[PDB]
């Protein structure tokens, strides 16, 4: 209890402020970095909930040294598992899904495919909120599909409900490379 509990990885929380007068990259803001469980909660418990963000804003949680953008060396050959949520329940459920996603990352829930995880992003959007897990290599089928399945399970989505993975290259130029 008196000693801090180390995480496997150091993580960085980023915030994207919707400001149309600036370039996309200039609207990114590094909030803080942490590498223990206690320091995660100290950060999480004292920042604004996703459900209280303005539309067009994002939070991103990425491994230290990976910027939360397509162009990063660790993202550019990769892709995302994308979850698009109904608007009605944002007040009720966005925060829960985002926290569950954060806990998957920091707890290293993806087993032997932890190295493939880059981070996660929540987009607060008028057309529907999105949460996604970003991975490093779209060609790594085993890793991508394991991460997908574990993530789907941790969100509680049933067997019927299929989610899709798309490469960042395809998004930035959309079909699913993989589904689980």
């Amino acid at each position: 209890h008196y000693i801090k509990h180390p995480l496997q990885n150091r993580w960085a929380l980023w915030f994207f402020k919707n400001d149309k007068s600036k370039t996309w990259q200039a609207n990114l803001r590094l909030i803080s970095k942490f590498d223990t469980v206690e320091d995660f909660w100290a950060l999480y418990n004292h920042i604004q909930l996703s459900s209280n963000l303005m539309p067009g804003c994002d939070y991103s949680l990425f491994k230290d040294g990976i910027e939360p953008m397509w162009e990063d060396e660790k993202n550019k050959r990769g892709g995302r598992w994308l979850i698009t949520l109904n608007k009605q329940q944002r007040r009720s459920d966005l925060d829960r899904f985002w926290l569950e996603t954060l806990l998957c990352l920091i707890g290293e829930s993806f087993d032997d495919y932890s190295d493939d995880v880059c981070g996660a992003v929540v987009n607060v959007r008028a057309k529907g909120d999105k949460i996604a897990i970003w991975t490093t290599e779209c060609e790594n089928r085993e890793a991508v599909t394991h991460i997908g399945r574990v993530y789907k399970e941790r969100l509680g989505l049933p067997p019927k409900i299929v989610i899709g993975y798309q490469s960042h290259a395809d998004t930035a130029t959309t079909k699913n490379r993989f589904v689980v």
Binding site: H5, Q8, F40, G107, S109
Partner: peptide, 12 residues
């Protein structure tokens, strides 16, 4: 290597 379950993370 360093893994935590959801319940171990939440009890903090």
């Amino acid at each position: 290597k360093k893994r935590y379950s959801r319940x171990q993370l939440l009890x903090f």
